[PDB]
């Protein structure tokens, strides 16, 4: 005898409309007036069908950290950063830039980098693993548990 869509939310017994990605909320929808939204600021954003009344601050890609802009900040997405031709993002979040490489899942760090030696990676043996790419983490070992339901590869842990 009633419904509620996926781009709507429930408030005050009425099913109101969420603001589209990029628009913030100004006031809530009533019986006879719908939700009023407003676009974000030139320097702001919002990822989602939302009901927030403030937008998010845009990511700055700082050159003093070696950061370039990979994709511009738009109303509906955040600024994406990356690094110069020979550099690496420290993590996926790419907060700054490094020259040292990181071992990928399946490998662990034998030797953290120093001076002009790059990080030294070895493959994880039986039974050790690495589920992340990292410049610091070595292979940690699998749980030696009771009910072995799934075996472990190397880059995943024994799930029991």
């Amino acid at each position: 005898p009633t419904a509620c869509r996926e781009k709507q939310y429930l408030i005050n017994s009425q099913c109101c409309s969420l603001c589209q990605p990029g628009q913030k909320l100004v006031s809530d929808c009533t019986e006879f007036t719908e939700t009023e939204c407003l676009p974000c600021g030139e320097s702001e954003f919002l990822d989602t069908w939302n009901r927030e009344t403030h937008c998010h601050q845009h990511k700055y890609c700082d050159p003093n950290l070696g950061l370039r802009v990979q994709q511009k900040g738009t109303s509906e997405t955040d600024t994406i950063c990356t690094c110069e031709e020979g550099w690496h993002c420290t993590s996926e979040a790419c907060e700054s830039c490094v020259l040292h490489r990181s071992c990928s899942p399946g490998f662990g760090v034998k030797q953290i980098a120093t001076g002009v030696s790059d990080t030294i990676c070895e493959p994880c043996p039986v039974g050790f693993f690495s589920n992340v790419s990292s410049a610091f983490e070595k292979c940690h070992p699998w749980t030696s548990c009771e009910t072995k339901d799934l075996v472990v590869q190397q880059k995943t842990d024994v799930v029991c």
Partner: antibody, heavy 116, light 114 residues
């Protein structure tokens, strides 16, 4: 009205210094990002500097990195370009341009000639 | 640094016919978040600042005659001016509006054949 009025251009000797102004009117200058685009004589358009609407984020083209510094004065409704250590390739018309994702209002254009 | 290569460099088109200006980017201008291609078109007339024509590759700016139609996506874009008019003589630029540094195409000088 929606206007952008450059001023400050002219002749200057190499290594010298210049400060272009941009006088915004007819809209809320605070709400917009601001840019400088130049055009070498008989050549194309080159984006050189950007300043954002909020925290005041700043990006440059590599070709003016170090020498040129973009700034704003929301209180005085104005965009500014400090050009320093000027080379002969800096000779161009300097275009003021507002942005809210895309350039949509441009300035008059003011000519900068770097010559001995 | 993204590179826009327009095509042709020069174009001579008869009055009232259709003008086709192509633009190719070294990278994709596609924002996966909002499904928009960040390609802007400009028309610069003699000794005049460029006037904005089309943004998000196909959205005609308010005020611009509907003869001006942007299109394309991925790396290949095109500006079409139908039923060409004399006042359409100018240089046309495509711009990367996807990331910094914002890079323009090298221009396309359109001449009106009378």
């Amino acid at each position: 009205e929606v206007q952008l009025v450059e001023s400050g251009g002219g002749l200057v000797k190499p290594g010298g210094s210049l400060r272009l102004s941009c006088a915004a009117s007819g809209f809320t200058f605070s709400d917009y990002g601001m840019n400088w685009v130049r055009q070498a004589p008989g050549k194309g358009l080159e984006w050189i500097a950007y300043i954002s609407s909020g925290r005041g984020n700043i990006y440059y083209a590599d070709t003016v990195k170090g020498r040129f510094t973009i700034s704003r004065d929301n209180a005085k409704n104005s965009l500014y370009l400090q050009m320093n250590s000027l080379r002969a390739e800096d000779t161009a018309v300097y275009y003021c341009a507002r942005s809210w994702g895309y350039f949509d209002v441009w300035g008059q254009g003011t000519t900068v000639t770097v010559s001995s | 640094d993204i590179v826009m290569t327009q095509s042709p460099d020069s174009l001579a088109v008869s009055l009232g016919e259709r003008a086709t200006i192509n633009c190719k980017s070294s990278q994709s201008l596609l924002n996966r978040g909002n499904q928009k291609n960040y390609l802007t078109w400009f028309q610069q007339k003699p000794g005049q600042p460029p006037k904005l024509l089309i943004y998000w590759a196909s959205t005609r700016e308010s005020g611009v005659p509907d003869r001006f139609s942007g299109s394309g996506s991925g790396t290949d874009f095109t500006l079409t001016i139908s039923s060409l008019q004399a006042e359409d003589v100018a240089v046309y630029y495509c711009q990367n509006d996807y990331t910094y540094p914002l890079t323009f195409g090298q221009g396309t000088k359109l001449e009106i054949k009378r």
